[PDB]
Input
Amino acid sequence: KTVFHLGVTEADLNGATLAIIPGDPARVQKIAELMDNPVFLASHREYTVYRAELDGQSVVVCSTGIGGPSTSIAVEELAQLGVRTFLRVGTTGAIQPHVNVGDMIVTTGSVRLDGASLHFAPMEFPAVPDFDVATAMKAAAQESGATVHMGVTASSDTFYPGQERYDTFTGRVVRRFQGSMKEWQDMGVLNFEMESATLLTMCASSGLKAGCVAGVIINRTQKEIPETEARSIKVVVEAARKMLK
Amino acid sequence: KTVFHLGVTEADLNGATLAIIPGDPARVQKIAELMDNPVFLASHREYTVYRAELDGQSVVVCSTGIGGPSTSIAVEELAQLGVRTFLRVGTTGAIQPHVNVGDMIVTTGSVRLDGASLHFAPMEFPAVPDFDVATAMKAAAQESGATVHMGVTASSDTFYPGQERYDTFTGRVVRRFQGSMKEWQDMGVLNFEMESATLLTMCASSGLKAGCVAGVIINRTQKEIPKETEARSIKVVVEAARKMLK
Amino acid sequence: KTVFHLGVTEADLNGATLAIIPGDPARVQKIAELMDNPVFLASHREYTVYRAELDGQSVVVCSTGIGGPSTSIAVEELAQLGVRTFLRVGTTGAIQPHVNVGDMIVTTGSVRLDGASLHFAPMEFPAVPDFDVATAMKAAAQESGATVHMGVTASSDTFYPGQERYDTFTGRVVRRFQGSMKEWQDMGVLNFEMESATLLTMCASSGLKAGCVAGVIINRTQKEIPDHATLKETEARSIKVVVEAARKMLK
Amino acid sequence: KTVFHLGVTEADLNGATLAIIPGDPARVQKIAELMDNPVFLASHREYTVYRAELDGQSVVVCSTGIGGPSTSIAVEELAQLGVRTFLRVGTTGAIQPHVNVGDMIVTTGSVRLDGASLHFAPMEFPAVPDFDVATAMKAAAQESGATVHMGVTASSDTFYPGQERYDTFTGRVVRRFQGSMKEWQDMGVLNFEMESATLLTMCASSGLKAGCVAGVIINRTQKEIPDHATLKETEARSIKVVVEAARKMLK
Amino acid sequence: KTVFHLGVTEADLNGATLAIIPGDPARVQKIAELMDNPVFLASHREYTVYRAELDGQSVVVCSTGIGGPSTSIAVEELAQLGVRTFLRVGTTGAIQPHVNVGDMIVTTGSVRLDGASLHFAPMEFPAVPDFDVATAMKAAAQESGATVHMGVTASSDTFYPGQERYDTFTGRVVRRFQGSMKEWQDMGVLNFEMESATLLTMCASSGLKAGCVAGVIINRTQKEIPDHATLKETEARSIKVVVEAARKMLK
Amino acid sequence: TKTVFHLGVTEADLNGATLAIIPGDPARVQKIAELMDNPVFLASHREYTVYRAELDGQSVVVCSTGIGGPSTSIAVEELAQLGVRTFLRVGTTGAIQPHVNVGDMIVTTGSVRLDGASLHFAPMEFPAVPDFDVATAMKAAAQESGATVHMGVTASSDTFYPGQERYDTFTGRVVRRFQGSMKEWQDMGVLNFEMESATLLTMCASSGLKAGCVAGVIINRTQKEIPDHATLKETEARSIKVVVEAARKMLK
Ligand SMILES: Cc1cn([C@H]2C[C@H](O)[C@@H](CO)O2)c(=O)[nH]c1=O
Ligand SMILES: Cc1cn([C@H]2C[C@H](O)[C@@H](CO)O2)c(=O)[nH]c1=O
Ligand SMILES: Cc1cn([C@H]2C[C@H](O)[C@@H](CO)O2)c(=O)[nH]c1=O
Ligand SMILES: Cc1cn([C@H]2C[C@H](O)[C@@H](CO)O2)c(=O)[nH]c1=O
Ligand SMILES: Cc1cn([C@H]2C[C@H](O)[C@@H](CO)O2)c(=O)[nH]c1=O
Ligand SMILES: Cc1cn([C@H]2C[C@H](O)[C@@H](CO)O2)c(=O)[nH]c1=O
Ligand SMILES: [Cl-]
Ligand SMILES: [Cl-]
Ligand SMILES: [Cl-]
Ligand SMILES: [Cl-]
Ligand SMILES: [Cl-]
Ligand SMILES: [Cl-]
Ligand SMILES: [Cl-]
Ligand SMILES: [Cl-]
Ligand SMILES: [Cl-]
Ligand SMILES: [Mg+2]
Ligand SMILES: [Mg+2]
Ligand code: NA
Ligand code: NA
Ligand code: NA
Output
C-alpha cells in the first residue's frame, strides 16, 4: 500500500496508530529522538517522516508543512496507513496580554479562518479536538511544569493579513480581518496559528482523534514578529505516552 | 437589579457565580431541591429562578425555555448579576446507533445550526464548552454510573426540520437539512438538541464558563418521536456543579 | 394523538383552525377570556394552551415562549392538529421616532436576524405575512382607534446584541450588529422583536397563514418613560385587536 | 436638476410623485394613453419616459428594462426627481398549477434571487411591497374581473437558469437552482419575474412606496408558448389595473 | 428556431458566430456601420439587433441593455442562434487616478458584484474573459494608439450604491459597499461597469468565448460630468477597436 | 536590512531581484535555478528553499512555496517585502478535461477559489486572475517549447482529496459542497486541479504584484491509462524550461 505524497508504506509505520505532526520538517527528527530507536523513513517536500518507539509502541512523527492544505494531505495519507490519533505541536502567537512567551496552549476549539476545514465539514461544524487528546495534552503540559492555557485558537490560512499583521508589503488588511485581532482578543481567543482549524475539523468529522498543543513564542500585544520549542516537543511526546493504550 | 426578563436582582442571588440552566421551568425546583436551602426567587415567562446552596456556596437554577434566543436572555441577565459559570442540562436525541437511551452526552463542541450564536461570534468561532466544565460533567456523569459520550452535538434552531424530522405537517425539509442527519452521523456527531450552540458560543466569546450534559431519551436511528433518565441527569449536573465550585 | 411539546390532541382543539399565539404563557388566559367559553387545555414548558369560542367558532390560544425556536415548535404541532392560521400578538420596542408608545405595528415583512427561518426557507425567501391576516390585523388595529404602522420588523434571535444593546455584561456587540440599529432605522424598520421572522417564513413557506401585530411599549429613540396607565392600556388593546383580527379571519 | 440615464428633469415630471414602471419601453405609451394628456418625455436606452395626468395629478410612466440593475437606475433617478411611489406592472410566468394563464398576481414578498437588492439591504431584509400599494393593486385587479392571487414571487437575475429552464444552449443549471422550481412550488411561490426583488427591497429600505402586479402570460407547469389573443387580453387588463391602482394611491 | 426576447432567428444572423454586444441600443447601428452591408434585423426592448459583414463574414451586433440580467438573456439567445464569441464594448468609469479619461480598459477579470453570474457558477468561479478575445482586444486597442489598461473591473448590479455613489436620493450606501471604492482602488481595480461579471462568468462556464473592452468616460476621482467632445472621441475609438478586435477573432 | 521570518533571507541576498519563480517542491528550486546563470543557494527553512540566479544579467529568485495557499502566501509576502514584484508559478497538475493530455501545459487565465487564503486578501467576488503580461509570456514560452498549451480556468483547492472529489480515501466520504463538484467544474470548462493558484493570483492581483501560473499535466482524471514514465520526466523538465523562458520574456 502506497500514498501519493508521504513516500511511506503501512509497513514502514510498524503498526503505529498515533502520529505526532509538527509543521517544520527539521523538528521531526528532534521529536523522534525523544523516543526510542528513532528511524528515518522518508523525506519529500515538506513531509519528513520518522518512526520511533514509545513504551514499546510504534509512533510516527510526520511534518505537515505550514497550513491546512499540506496538513490535510499528511493526515489523510497517515490515516490511510493506519494512523488514528494525531498530536499537533507547533509555535504560536498569543493575543491575550496575560498569556506569556513560554506558556503552552492546548486548543479546546479553533476559529476556522481557513479554507481546508470546509472541505470536510461546513462552517457550522466545530473545529474541536478529541476530548481524550485534549485531556492528555493538558495533563502532559501541566505535569511538565509549564503554564498552560485551555481555550480558543484563531486558526488562519495566512500568517500576515489573517493574523492582522501590518508590517507587510501592502501594509493593509482586507475588510474581513481589519480589527479582527482585537475582536478575537475580546472574544477570549488565546492565540494565532495556521493548522488547527483544518486538523481538528478534518479529524472530528472523520473518526480521527486529534489535539493541538502550542508553545507561545510571541505575544501579539507586544509586537508583530519574533527553548519554548524544546519544552513543547517534550510535552507532545508525554501527551503521546498518555494516549497510548 | 433588576434584569429585564428574569425578575431577579444581584442580591437575590446571594453571591452566586454558578448557574444550572435547564430548559423546562418545572425542572428548576427539581434541580434546586437536590441542593441545600432551595428558595424560589422569581417566575416570569419560561424563566423560573431558584437559589440554592451547594457545599456552602450559593448556586442559581434558572430555566432557559426552548432554544438559543430565550437561552441567550437568561445567560446574559444572569451574567449581569454576577454569574460566570453556566451548567446546561437537558434531554437529547442521539443520531449514532451505539448511543443508547439512558446514556449521557457531554458536548465537546456544537454544530451551529442556530442563529443566536451568530449574535456573539461569527460562524467560524467554535461552539466550544469551557474545558473545566466539560471535564467536570464527564466525571460527574461517569460517577453516577451512567454511560457517557464525549463528542460533537448538532444544535438546531428547530425541533423538526433542523433535526430532519419528516413526520410533520408538511412532511418536507428544506434543501439545507435534507440528508443532514446522515451527514452529521457520518461526521461522528452524537446527538441533536437546541441550545448548546448558542450557549457555548455566547459564553466562550464572553468570558463565561459553560458546558452541556444531556440524557438521551430517544435514538433517531430508531424513530423520530420520543423518566429514569430525567432524574439521573440532574443529579449529574449538580455533581458537576459541585466539582466546579471553587 | 398527543403532540410532544404542547401536550394536546386534535380533539382538544374542537375543530379550531385558527390560533392566537402570544409569547408569554401568562397572557394566554387573558386572551382566551376575551372570547367565549375559555377552557384551559394544557400547560407544559413555555407552552400554555387555551381554547375558546369566537362567534361560535373554536379558537386556540397558545404561547410560543421567546424566540423562533420555541415558536416553531408550537406552530408545527398546532399545524399537525389542524391549525392553519396563526395570529401573532405581543409588545415591542419601536426604533423610529415617529412611532409612539401605545401605537401598534402590523408587520408587512421581517428582517430575518434569526436562524429558525432558515430551517424552512433559504435567506432569499421573504419573511412576509399572509395578506389576509395582515389586512385583518390592520383593520382591527385601526378600528381600535390606535395609530397603526404598516412596515418592516427586525426579528432578532437575541434581545441584546442582535438589537444592538450595549448595556450588557460584556458591553460588546459583534461586528455584524455594530451600527445595525442605525442601519435598520435608516432603512425604515419600525421595531425589534424576536419571533416574526421565524413565524412568517415558516408559515409562508408551509402553506400556513400568519401575521404579526404588536403594541409599542417602548421607543429606543425616546428618552421619555411611558406611564403605567399607557403601558396597561397598550397591553390590553393589543390583545383586544388580535381577537378582533381573529374575528375578521373567521369564515 | 438632471439625471444620468433617464434624460428627464424634475420640471418634465410636472410634480409627479407616483411612477408606473413597466419593463418593456413599448408598454410605456400604452399605459400613458390610459391617462389624461400623455406626453412623451424621453427615450434613452431601455428607458422610455412619458408623463400623464390621472385625476388632475401628474403621473410618470417609465420603463425599467429587464432586470434589477436597469430597474434600480430608473427608480433612483425618478426618486431624485421627486417620485415617491412606484407601481410595477409586468408579465410573469406562474409556477403553481392552480394559477391559470390570464390570472393576475400581486406580490406580497419576493424571493431575492437577484443581486441588486443586496446593494440596498442585506439578504435578511424582506423584499416587501408597501402595504397601501399592494392593497390598491389587489383591489384594482379584483375590480377588473381578473382572478387575483396574493403571494410570494420568485425574482430572478436570469430568465433561464435562475428560473430553472433547461431548454437552453448548455442545457445546464447550476447546483443552486437545480430543483429550485419544485422547491419554490412547495414553498407556495406563485411566479417568476426578474425585477421585483430589487424594486421592493430598494424601495422598502429607502422610504419609497412600491408594489408589483403581473399578468400571468404562461404557466411553467403547462406550456411556454402563449396563445396570442389570451396574451393580448391579459396585457391590456394588466395596464388598466395598474392605472386604477395608481388612481387608488393618489386619492 | 425562435428565441424568446431578441426577435431574431438563426437565418437572420447569416451564419454569424461572433457578436459585438454594446449596452446602448443606439450604439448598435454605429457599430454595424463600421462594417460591410450593415442590416437592421430587429428592435425589441433593450435589444436592438443588427447584422453586418467583416472581411466577408457575418457579424451580429446586439445591445444588452444595462445589467447582467438583460445581458444574460441576449447572450443565451444569441448562443441558441449559433453565436459562440461575444465581444463586449461599453462605457465605464475608472477609479484609478493613473487611468485617464479617454484611456481604454480590457478586463482581465471582474469583481462579481452582481447576481446573475451566480446563476451560472458559484462565486468562487473566476469572472474571466476568453484569453484569445482579451488578447485580440488588447492588440486592437493598442494598435489604435489608445492608452490601454489590462486589469480588474468591478462589475456592479447597481450604478449608485454598488459603485459607492452618495449623491443619491437617500445619500446612503449599504454596509457592504461603504468604503468599497477605496477597497477596490487599493486592490488595483481599474473601473466600474455593470455587465462584465455576468457576461464573463456565464461565457467562461458555458463554452462561450467572451471579453470586455471599455472606453473610460469618467474618472471617479475627478468629475462625474464628461466633456462632450472627449466622450464622443472615446466612444468612437472604442467601437472601432471592438470591430478590429472582432476582425482578429475571425477564423 | 531585516531577515524575513520564514524565508531566512535579506533584500541584499536577492541581489536586486524583482522576479521570483515559485515552484511547490523545494527539491525543484535548484533544478530551476541551474537553468539560469550563477545559481546560488540562499537559504532552506521549512518548505522554503531559496536560490538566487541570473537571467540575461538580471537577478532572479527561485523559492519553493510548499503545498497550499497558506505556505505560498508567506513566501510571496516575504519576497515582496524584499522587493520582488513578479511571481511565476510552476508546478504539476491533474487535468480534468478529456482533451487535455499528460505532457500538455496549462496556463491559468483564472482560478476557481476553492481555497481560504485568497479570502485573506480579497473577498470571494474578486477574480483570481493572473497578470496579463505573465499569462501572455507563459503562453508564448510554453508554445515555443513545442508543448500543447491550454489557456483556461483552474480549480484551486485547499485539499488534494475531498476538494478535488477523490473518494479513494480513509473515509471515502466527500462533504456535500464537493459532491459532484468534479463533473460541475468539467461541465464549466475548468481544465485542471491544483492547490496554490487561487491564493497566489488573488493575493498578487489585489496587492499590485504580477503573477501567473503555468503547469505541466502529469495526470488526467478522465483517462484510465497510466501516465508514461518517459512523458512524465519530459514534462518535469519542460515545465521548468518554460517558466524560465517566461521569466526571460517578463524581464525583457
Ligand atoms: C509565531 C507564530 C507562529 N505561527 C505558526 C504558523 C506556522 O505554522 C508556524 C510558523 O510560522 O507557526 C502563527 O500562525 N502565528 C504566529 O504568530
Ligand atoms: C428528544 C429531543 C429533545 N431535544 C431538546 C430540545 C428541547 O430543548 C428539549 C425538549 O424538546 O429537548 C431535541 O432537540 N431533539 C430531540 O430529539
Ligand atoms: C421592548 C422589547 C421587547 N422585545 C420582545 C422580545 C420578547 O419576546 C418580548 C419580551 O421581552 O418582547 C424585543 O425583542 N425588543 C424590545 O425592545
Ligand atoms: C413568461 C415569463 C416572463 N418573465 C419576465 C422577464 C422579463 O422581464 C419579461 C419578458 O420576458 O417577463 C420571467 O421572468 N419569467 C417568465 O416565465
Ligand atoms: C460612467 C459609468 C458608466 N457605467 C456603465 C453602466 C451602464 O451600463 C453604462 C451607462 O451608464 O455605463 C458604470 O457602471 N459606472 C460609471 O461610472
Ligand atoms: C496530480 C495532481 C497534482 N496536484 C498538485 C498538488 C500538489 O501541490 C502537487 C503535488 O501533488 O500537485 C493537485 O492538486 N491535483 C492533482 O490531481
Ligand atoms: Cl513545528
Ligand atoms: Cl513577545
Ligand atoms: Cl430541561
Ligand atoms: Cl423534503
Ligand atoms: Cl429510541
Ligand atoms: Cl406576549
Ligand atoms: Cl412590461
Ligand atoms: Cl454601450
Ligand atoms: Cl513544483
Ligand atoms: Mg510599506
Ligand atoms: Mg401530511
Ligand atoms: Na423559548
Ligand atoms: Na436592462
Ligand atoms: Na505547506
Observations:
- The domain at 1-246 of chain B is CATH 3.40.50.1580 (Rossmann fold).
- DSSP finds six helices and nine strands in chain B.
- Chain B has one domain: 1-246.
